[PDB]
């Protein structure tokens, strides 16, 4: 089975969250430009708005969110989860772990992909060296000939 | 207007650069005229003497060989090169004048370009 869905439909999600639709997190690190850094900063950067700016009631200020004000409050509250391995749950710790999990969920093929890439780049570089030698050997007859043409001007 | 290197510094520099390039590859400016290009150059080359046309072919072959080998003419023959010593422009002008006259009064083209 797949992961459960908290809401039956998008309209139900919007009604629950006051008109805001919490986007699917499967490809959130690839859907957003600079996805990993963006998600980590957005989760951890819940700061105070500058002077003169007033966010409309019901919203929370986030500098890294396009627009300034985001619908989710700060959920990565310090001491919200109890890790099963013995790691202190600080906001930065939870941010890094969640971004790692989301980045895996958005790209589960990274390890195999990188291994294949390294092997094939190396092997194809060797092939390129051999192909250059082959070309220089085939053309060596022409590129070193001496032709007498009976002309000067 | 008519801008020649005697009355134009920019034309002098242009001619100097062209002379340098042609001397590097050792081929006259008229050798760049492709017979397949115009078909008037083809006729003009058909009317020229065999010694001249053979010299043109030899110079072109030498230039192509130098181009393949990625080298230039040695400085001796480079100083012995004579670009812009034309051999074809007068004949080409005669051919084009004859074609213009024939077209102007009646006449069918003596030669035509295939499609394409």
């Amino acid at each position: 089975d797949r992961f459960p869905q908290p809401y039956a439909n998008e309209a139900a999600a919007r009604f629950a969250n006051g008109g805001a639709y919490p986007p699917d997190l499967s490809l959130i690190t690839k859907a957003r430009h600079n996805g990993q850094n963006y998600v980590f900063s957005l989760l951890t950067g819940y700061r105070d708005p500058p002077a003169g700016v007033s966010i409309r009631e019901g919203l929370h200020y986030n500098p890294y969110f396009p627009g300034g004000a985001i619908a989710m409050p700060k959920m990565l509250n310090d001491g919200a989860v109890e890790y099963e391995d013995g790691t202190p749950a600080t906001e930065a710790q939870m941010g890094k772990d969640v971004v790692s999990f989301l980045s895996w969920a958005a790209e589960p093929e990274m390890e195999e992909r990188k291994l294949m890439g390294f092997k094939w780049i190396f092997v194809l570089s060797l092939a390129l060296l051999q192909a250059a030698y082959y070309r220089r050997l085939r053309w060596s007859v022409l590129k070193s000939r001496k032709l007498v043409l009976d002309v000067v001007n | 207007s008519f801008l020649d290197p005697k009355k134009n510094w920019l034309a002098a520099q242009h001619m100097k650069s062209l002379v340098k390039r042609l001397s590097k590859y050792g081929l006259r400016y008229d050798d760049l005229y492709d017979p397949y290009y115009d078909l008037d150059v083809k006729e003009a080359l058909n009317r020229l003497p065999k010694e001249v046309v053979d010299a043109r072919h030899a110079r072109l072959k030498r230039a192509i060989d130098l181009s393949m080998k990625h080298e230039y003419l040695p400085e001796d023959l480079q100083a012995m090169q004579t670009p812009f010593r034309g051999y074809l422009q007068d004949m080409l002008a005669l051919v084009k004048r004859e074609r213009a006259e024939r077209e102007a009064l009646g006449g069918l083209p003596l030669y035509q370009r295939s499609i394409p």
Binding site: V151, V152, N153 | P49, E51, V52, D54, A55, A79, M80, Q81, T82, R85
Partner: peptide
């Protein structure tokens, strides 16, 4: 250095 048109039978032609 450049030969005159007197030499080079193709130049003469």
């Amino acid at each position: 250095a450049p030969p005159p048109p007197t030499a080079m039978i193709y130049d003469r032609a």
